[PDB]
Amino acid sequence: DRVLSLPAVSKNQVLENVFHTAPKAPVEHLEKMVSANSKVYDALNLQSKRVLIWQVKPALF
């Protein structure tokens, strides 16, 4: 019964209690806000090819 003197908690159960959650990448905040601010650029810039300024305030000609 030498196995009953070994630590009963497995090496697996250490690696799933220490590494419980997949950690958040540093770059996943950049490349997720950048793709969402690229829609703020598109709609709201005045130099974009798809501005909403002629759709929401139609021009007086």
Added chain:
Amino acid sequence: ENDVPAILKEIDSLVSREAVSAKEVSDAAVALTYLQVKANRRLWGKVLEKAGAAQDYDAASLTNLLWAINTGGVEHFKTVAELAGPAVSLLPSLSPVQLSIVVEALGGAGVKNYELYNKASAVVVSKIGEFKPAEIARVLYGVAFGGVNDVALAKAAGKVFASTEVDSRTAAQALYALAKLGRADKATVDALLKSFKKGTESASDAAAASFALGSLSFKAE
């Protein structure tokens, strides 16, 4: 150095920026009538686009704008009829010489604002001596063409046109206002009809007195 199309591009870049105020959009409109810019419609469109966006409006910039809209012959009902919001809030703040330009421009465009012309006729009969004869005709042109059949003003204007004889252009505006009201008062049409052989300078007021006489069916002059 006398640059008229190069000053249109300098006016175009004044009203194409982001935070044009009332005074900068008044004077852009005033400069487009003195320059007689009927050919460029988009430049007149950029001015009335900023004229709806402009939020503060003192007494002098509202009447300079409304003069320029009326004199320039530019009409956009949405822009001009929402300029009656500044006017009913600046109405005790307005000069008697300035209230004639507001009500003539808002009336001549057809702005259906009964709160404006009720308060702007009650002012012009509370101070009837304070208004020169050209100003009582401009208010009368406005209240008539704004859809108000105010005969209280048309009597008080008729007592002024009998006491003092008026200019030719002053009378023909007053005839045109009484023609739309459909009044045909012999006491006041003939008091305004004597102003038309001292020499008239425009043909627009000879043609409008022509229209106003025939619509009331008086006879030619």
